[PDB]
């Protein structure tokens, strides 16, 4: 039938492994799936582009995460700049150390 | 030789070798002479330390 795009595959992967919505998810959905689940399993499959497409359709919801992620995809060795890397880590550590969305924590 | 120079940020010396080669009477095709010149042009357009603008 043809290997579908990593995005549509992941979407057709979320259908199975989470049939019902978990009540602890955050930042809404994207085309019927939680935005953070798509980002994680896309990065897990190794297709950062497929993950960034997900981000582009949730620009308003994800807040400042867009400019941070777009830097991660650009910078080599899967590392951000110390300055920006510091900005996000402190934010996560500030009030998101224990968030009800595990996929958000992971990413 | 030019590859050695460039990795050592000696771009001007590489541009010199490439240019002379392009003007020479060695058996070099026109298209190769075009590549040599194009590289020299790039290498001479960037700073090389110890050499005047």
């Amino acid at each position: 039938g043809g290997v579908p795009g990593t995005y549509q595959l992941v979407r057709s992967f979320l259908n199975i492994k989470l049939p019902a919505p978990l009540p602890g998810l955050q930042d809404g959905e994207v085309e019927g799936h939680p935005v953070w689940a798509l980002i994680y399993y896309c990065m897990r499959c190794g297709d950062l582009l497929a993950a960034s497409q997900v981000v582009n359709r949730a620009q308003h919801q994800l807040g400042e995460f867009k400019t941070w992620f777009q830097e991660y995809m650009n910078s080599k060795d899967r590392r951000l700049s110390p300055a920006t890397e510091n900005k996000l880590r402190l934010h996560y550590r500030r009030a998101l150390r224990n968030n009800t969305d595990p996929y958000k924590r992971a990413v | 030789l030019c590859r050695f120079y460039t990795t050592r940020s000696r771009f001007f010396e590489a541009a010199q070798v490439q240019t002379n080669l392009a003007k020479s009477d060695l058996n070099i095709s026109l298209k190769d002479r075009i590549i040599l010149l194009s590289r020299a042009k790039g290498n001479a357009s960037v700073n090389t330390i110890g050499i005047s603008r």
Binding site: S81, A83 | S9, R10, T48, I49, G50
Partner: protein
Amino acid sequence: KPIINKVASVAENKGLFEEAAKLYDLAKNADKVLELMNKLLSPVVPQISAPQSNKERLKNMALSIAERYRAQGISANKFVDSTFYLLLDLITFFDEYHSGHIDRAFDIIERLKLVPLNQESVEERVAAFRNFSDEIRHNLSEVLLATMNILFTQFKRDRDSQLRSQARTLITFAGMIPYRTSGDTNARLVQMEVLMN
């Protein structure tokens, strides 16, 4: 003039330097504007100036204060003022260094006559460091390394003797100067000079 300093004074006491500068600058109190502007710049001198960063947002206000302070011929005492325009030059030195414009960045540091490059200047440059603002001595570590890494890159590209001589100069200067992270810095400086030979 008083209340603008009163309001500027408290906001200064509450670590709101970026505001206290705008307020003190509103009352044309350059003694305080440049003082605070020295504190906000020193931490960001070696940092990477990137769009919307805290460097751009501070550098661009400092330059908007440099023009308006030259076009209007305003200046604080030479201590506060000298350091303020000196940091602005260094901020340019790293903005050129982080961009790969090695030749251009080398020329700037040479003008400042802050780091000696010929053995003859070591005695006087070393004495000057003693009375330069600590907002400058703080960033001496990153300046020596960038300058060294600059000579370091230019070496891989007579001239060899000249770079080698300058390499030595930086080391002896750093050897006679007690400063921030002199341990890691003095070691790295010596290693980069060995690879040259």
